Design an enzyme around this catalytic site. Sequence first.
Site, PDB file in Angstrom:
ATOM      1  N   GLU A 186       0.773  -1.254   0.000  1.00 56.77           N
ATOM      2  CA  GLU A 186       0.000   0.000   0.000  1.00 56.77           C
ATOM      3  C   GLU A 186       0.806   1.308   0.000  1.00 56.77           C
ATOM      4  O   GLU A 186       0.569   2.173   0.831  1.00 56.77           O
ATOM      5  CB  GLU A 186      -1.030  -0.003   1.142  1.00 56.77           C
ATOM      6  N   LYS A 296     -13.256  -0.554  16.842  1.00 58.31           N
ATOM      7  CA  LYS A 296     -12.573   0.447  17.668  1.00 58.31           C
ATOM      8  C   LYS A 296     -11.185   0.640  17.092  1.00 58.31           C
ATOM      9  O   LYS A 296     -10.479  -0.333  16.883  1.00 58.31           O
ATOM     10  CB  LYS A 296     -12.464  -0.030  19.116  1.00 58.31           C
TER      11      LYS A 296
HETATM   12  O1  LIG Z   1      -6.938   6.603   4.071  1.00 58.44           O
HETATM   13  C1  LIG Z   1      -7.878   6.026   4.952  1.00 58.44           C
HETATM   14  C2  LIG Z   1      -7.825   4.500   4.904  1.00 58.44           C
HETATM   15  O2  LIG Z   1      -7.510   4.073   3.589  1.00 58.44           O
HETATM   16  C3  LIG Z   1      -7.679   2.687   3.396  1.00 58.44           C
HETATM   17  O3  LIG Z   1      -7.499   2.375   2.031  1.00 58.44           O
HETATM   18  C4  LIG Z   1      -6.678   1.953   4.276  1.00 58.44           C
HETATM   19  O4  LIG Z   1      -6.911   0.565   4.200  1.00 58.44           O
HETATM   20  C5  LIG Z   1      -6.811   2.388   5.734  1.00 58.44           C
HETATM   21  O5  LIG Z   1      -5.783   1.821   6.519  1.00 58.44           O
HETATM   22  C6  LIG Z   1      -6.800   3.906   5.865  1.00 58.44           C
HETATM   23  O6  LIG Z   1      -7.118   4.241   7.197  1.00 58.44           O
END
Ligand SMILES: OC[C@H]1O[C@@H](O)[C@H](O)[C@@H](O)[C@@H]1O
Length: 394
Positions: A186, A296
């Site tokens: 990611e 949570k």
């Molecule tokens: O940016 C907000 C959210 O994006 C999502 O794609 C991610 O999986 C999360 O971890 C993140 O909190």
Amino acid sequence: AWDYDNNVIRGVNLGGWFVLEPYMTPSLFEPFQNGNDQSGVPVDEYHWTQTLGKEAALRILQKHWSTWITEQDFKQISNLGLNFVRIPIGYWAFQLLDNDPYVQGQVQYLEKALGWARKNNIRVWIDLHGAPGSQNGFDNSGLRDSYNFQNGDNTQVTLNVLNTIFKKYGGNEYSDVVIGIELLNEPLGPVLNMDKLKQFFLDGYNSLRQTGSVTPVIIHDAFQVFGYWNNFLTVAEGQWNVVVDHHHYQVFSGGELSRNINDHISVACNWGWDAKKESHWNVAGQWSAALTDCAKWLNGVNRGARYEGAYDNAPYIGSCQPLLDISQWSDEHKTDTRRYIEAQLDAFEYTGGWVFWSWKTENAPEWSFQTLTYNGLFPQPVTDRQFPNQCGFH
Ligand SMILES: OC[C@H]1O[C@@H](O)[C@H](O)[C@@H](O)[C@@H]1O
Ligand SMILES: OC[C@H]1O[C@@H](O)[C@H](O)[C@@H](O)[C@@H]1O
């Protein structure tokens, strides 16, 4: 060790094990609360280890590493008809930056896990889940609210860690177990320099192949649109055994959360249609059953839920409290959940398969394969359908 053309991945992530995530193991973070005040709770593994100091961090993590996932879990994963696990690990298991607070020792358990995988006929991806400086500012990178992966020497350090992973796990010793090494979980494309990210992916690819490894290289999609990666790492250019990892949720914005169940299903089905058009092998490496962001600390320590209008300026949709315990779920919410799981399974099996996030959580049912299975909401066997053919794939 895997046929990406003919086989389908049916897997679970072993999350919360080597990289702490507050929402998955809140018991490790809750001792820092002062009554109802969460202002002193460490927000990520970086700050958790820093606050405890090296001695306490190692004592508490050793206990966690030795109990959170064991050989018995691998037997249960096999018994449920799963064939694959994805194993997130942080850079700090291999290399520390000069003033890093992190402790080491994860590698011992990673190597036990590879053996448990072998014994139970389970295949593996190793996933570099956190890079120095953070690639996304998510708490699951180890370091929240920082985006410095492309700054200073952090990209170079990441490549050095990857080379260690490549020499250890990309060679003949584990070629019957390891079916992919995922270069970086990611990376947050919108805030990064995409040209530099592509160069990093290319350097990692070339570095692995130069070791004599034939292990598949897994690239995360960096939150780009479907098809973005079609022209990168291609057979036309002699680049081979490349898989794209797409992650899919419908809970991290007000717009997604406000969809009715039918619209949630339509979106899931479209994930399948669009992935089919892509030119690389692809797998849904993270997804879940969640239709809310109520768990949570899912959004982070000291942040609320959009679902109940308590974060990100989202409108109130409903109260989270009733949804925290699967025993309190309405019949309608259970049905909606089963429908949503089946639509996602069909969509993801339409290409390379799927890897649910995650095997287990302490008390967040939407994010626990175990809990959903035991409560009859995740199909068992995983091919069972109460809502057959929602998507109409052909
Ligand atoms: O940016 C907000 C959210 O994006 C999502 O794609 C991610 O999986 C999360 O971890 C993140 O909190
Ligand atoms: O196009 C699908 C797949 O074809 C294979 O021949 C290549 O080695 C892979 O890298 C690619 O993902």
